[PDB]
Design a protein around this ligand. Structure first.
Ligand SMILES: Clc1ccc(N2CCN(Cc3c[nH]c4ncccc34)CC2)cc1
Ligand SMILES: Clc1ccc(N2CCN(Cc3c[nH]c4ncccc34)CC2)cc1
Lengths: 341, 340
């Protein structure tokens, strides 16, 4: 019976302690404050707000079985608060995964959070006096629940889908433009070690120094790229002077040098691959826990003579609010970048 | 029950004593005009207003027996005054915590904050115009109990843990620079060729500048002094002279282990300036928590017993914080502690 009591108090306690640390970490440290992390702070503070203006009163309503006792104005304020807060969290996800496009030329990160917070209100603000004191309310409204289920769920869902697909395509294009140089350098070194005349080593060193500039597309990565370019130019000069017998040893030293930075560059490669993975994980948790919710909230409201399942309604509400405590868990146990506890 | 009025009169007298003492100390020191004490003026004003416009008539009622013979419109005016002042006190405590956290995290942008503080204190006291003389409302009661206590309490708690974490990070960064300079100086004492000296001295300069983040100026004067001495050593070293690197490193080590005394004194001063925040916010919570908890409970649990003795006790407990906060400000921090 009172399964919502224990579960509710555990959820509210671990969401009070959950997103609060995400706010105490950024505003304290300086090496971790980024516009991405500022968006994360806005998102977590949005989840911290829902833990008090909705969760306790929602749980107390669920204790009586869902039967409301106070007037209509208080219930309308609490419901509009919940709509604004969920819309704000999902549009904070929107702004976060929009800022996660480093392929763009500090920045005006104010506008994203501001528009998120404004449309969160603008979509949830017009309560029109609880639908104009609709008659026989006794103890949600048409043509507005549909609006707050489309503009607050479906549209940001397609936004997340578009953003992750664009991220996939962009990272694949970046790694392809890098793999071009990856293969050209090996082919040219092989040619140098197997050439026949002074022009073949020259062409191989040309194509080697050619691929050196196509990789400039994005601190210690600078000091590494400046030492081997001089060696490549020395090898090019030696090959220009008809010194293949010396260009071979030059290429041996060049391989021994560049393979020293290979092992430092692949770490950054895996660095960003894991970042994209954790982004996908955050969006996937959002979907997992808020899809059955808004699916029910749109279908049962649009499908009258179809089963709605009261138990399913309460369960999808509990799941959607479990998401509110899932995103600060993902930046915690699923992601190891937030070392400051 | 004569002891009730005795305690009430003593509490009113001590509210007057504490807040008027804050006022007189501000008006007789001239060195208290700092952002730390900038908010205490609003606190003293709000507490004196609570002790003149509520507490006399509040105790009138409390000794009358809760009957209240006053017209319900004057009752609503007094209730609005009490809401406004109890809201202004808590919002100004939140603003104190805000100022502390911002001073930890980074001119005069607190006038807007105090103006909004008192404006919102008035905004929560307006629906009493359209509302026994208790909080005779259900929807409004929860609203005022939530927006005026349940929000600022957790907000200042979060800001206070943020102050703790930021101060710990500042401490850790400066201790890291300390040990980095220790290691680099122990290296230069034993350095061999000149390129290693150049690299290590670049490292030392980088650490010295990375640490650079009435007496806060005397700490930075040693910063630029050490920077200029590192520049001296770097010139004498890149000129191809190894012994002069150590010659300058001797005085650099002297300056380094000399500034640490003032650094640790500053760390102790910051810890002491945060402990007063701890005590103040903790006492405020202890005093003003059960009142609003029982209020929101009685507003959420109608057919649930709330004895009026609880009402009187928690109201006295709430007013105890308005009595105590100037005393707590005077006991801690050496501005008022060393004068008296
Ligand atoms: Cl008697 C009673 C008392 C309180 C409540 N609560 C109010 C807040 N909630 C509304 C809500 C949660 N998620 C949403 N998503 C989109 C649109 C609306 C919502 C639901 C729970 C419900 C019944
Ligand atoms: Cl029969 C009777 C007669 C007079 C009173 N008084 C009215 C003014 N007071 C209201 C009050 C105290 N703290 C608050 N915090 C937030 C909001 C309102 C308040 C309490 C004392 C009470 C009962």
């Amino acid at each position: 019976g009172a399964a919502a009591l224990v579960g509710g108090v555990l959820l509210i306690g671990l969401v009070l302690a959950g997103n609060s640390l995400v706010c105490v970490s950024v505003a304290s440290e300086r090496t971790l404050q980024t516009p991405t992390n500022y968006f994360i702070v806005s998102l977590a503070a949005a989840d911290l707000l829902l833990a008090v203006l909705v969760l306790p009163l929602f749980v107390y309503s669920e204790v009586q079985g869902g039967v409301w006792l106070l007037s209509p104005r208080l219930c309308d304020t609490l419901m509009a608060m919940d709509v604004m807060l969920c819309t704000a969290s999902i549009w904070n996800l929107c702004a976060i995964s929009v800022d996660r496009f480093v392929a763009v030329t500090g920045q005006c990160q104010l506008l994203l959070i501001a528009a998120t917070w404004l449309l969160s209100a603008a979509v949830a603000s017009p309560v029109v006096c609880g639908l104009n004191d609709v008659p026989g309310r006794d103890p949600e409204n048409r043509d507005y629940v549909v609006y707050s289920s489309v503009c607050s769920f479906f549209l940001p869902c397609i936004l997340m889908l578009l953003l992750y697909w664009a991220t996939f395509r962009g990272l694949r294009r970046w790694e392809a433009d890098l793999e071009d140089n990856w293969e050209t350098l090996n082919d040219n070194l092989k040619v140098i070690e197997k050439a026949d005349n002074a022009a073949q080593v020259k062409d191989a060193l040309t194509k080697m120094r050619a691929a050196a500039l196509d990789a400039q597309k994005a601190k210690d990565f600078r000091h590494g790229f400046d030492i081997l370019v001089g060696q490549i130019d020395d090898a090019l000069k030696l090959a220009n002077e008809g010194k293949v017998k010396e260009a071979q040893a030059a290429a041996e030293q060049l391989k021994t040098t560049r393979n020293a930075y290979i092992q430092k560059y692949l770490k950054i490669t895996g660095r960003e691959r894991k970042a994209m993975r954790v982004l996908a994980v955050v969006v996937g948790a959002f979907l997992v826990c808020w899809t059955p919710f808004f699916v029910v909230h749109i279908t049962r409201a649009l499908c009258p003579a179809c089963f709605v399942s009261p138990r399913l309604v309460s369960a999808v509400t509990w799941l959607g609010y479990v998401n509110s405590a899932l995103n600060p868990i993902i930046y915690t146990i699923f992601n190891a970048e937030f070392r400051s506890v």
